[PDB]
Structure 1
């Protein structure tokens, strides 16, 4: 579990969105596993606008933060699950690091701010749905 609170928006993994997220839906994309909903309260997370390939992510299955190098956002094949059929997930970044079901939602950050959130993982790997291209989150 985990979300990004920026301005009047809440960004979460689409497969983990609630009834409230869908009733106040701003934008959603199954291929990216992202859903953004509107909020009444103001959010204060800063989103990074960079091309960093190093950062720190929160791993709830270990209750620890870990430094990682990560790949550039790209189309990556993702195995069938109870949420999606077998498909390519776009804007995904991979890193070597621990990750198990339940770590989705954990924030990945660089010196500039929030880069994205855990969405995939397995075999000593962790996939992060990137949010740096969503320039509208700020305005």
Structure 2
């Protein structure tokens, strides 16, 4: 679990969005596994606007942060799960690192701010949904 809180927005994994997220929906994209809802309180986070390919992510199944080298956002095949049919997920970045069910929502950050959130994983890999192209999150 986990979310990004920026301005009057909450960014979560679409497959983990709550009834309240859907009732306050701003934007969602099943192909990116992202959903953004509106909040009444001002958020705690700031978003990176960069092309960093190194950063640090929070891994809840180890209660630890790990440094990672990650690929540029791209279209990657994701096998069927309880949440989605087999499909290509867009704006996804892979890295070698631990992740298991429950780790989605963990934040990936570089020196410039929040880059994205854990969205996929397995076999010593961890995949992050990028948020750096969502310029409207800042206004």
Q: Into which bin does the TM-score normalised by the smaller protein fall?
A: over 0.9
What's the counterpart of residue 102 of structure 2?
Answer: 102
TM-score by length of 1: 1.00
Please state how far the C-alpha of 1:37 moved relative to its aligned partner.
Answer: 0.1
Q: Distance in 1 between matches of 2:30 and 2:5?
A: 20
The alignment's C-alpha RMSD in Å is 0.3
Residue correspondence of structure 1 range 1-139 to structure 2 within 5 A: 1-139=1-139
SS at 1:40 equivalent: coil
Q: Distance in 1 between matches of 2:122 and 2:44?
A: 31
SS at 1:41 equivalent: coil
Please state how far the C-alpha of 1:103 moved relative to its aligned partner.
Answer: 0.2
SS at 2:51 equivalent: coil
- CA shift digits 1:46-76 (9 cap, x unpaired): 1000000000000000000000000000000
SS at 2:6 equivalent: strand
Please state how far the C-alpha of 1:40 moved relative to its aligned partner.
Answer: 0.3
Query: Unaligned regions of 5+ residues in structure 2, if any?
Result: none
Q: Distance in 2 between matches of 1:108 and 1:44?
A: 15
Please state how far the C-alpha of 1:97 moved relative to its aligned partner.
Answer: 0.5
Please state how far the C-alpha of 1:41 moved relative to its aligned partner.
Answer: 0.2
Q: Distance in 1 between matches of 2:74 and 2:3?
A: 22
Moved over 3 A (4+): none
Please state how far the C-alpha of 1:44 moved relative to its aligned partner.
Answer: 2.4
Q: Distance in 1 between matches of 2:53 and 2:129?
A: 13
Please state how far the C-alpha of 1:104 moved relative to its aligned partner.
Answer: 0.1
Structure with a larger share of its residues in strand = 1
Q: Distance in 1 between matches of 2:21 and 2:93?
A: 24
Alignment size in residue pairs? 139
Q: Distance in 1 between matches of 2:122 and 2:83?
A: 17
TM-score by length of 2: 1.00
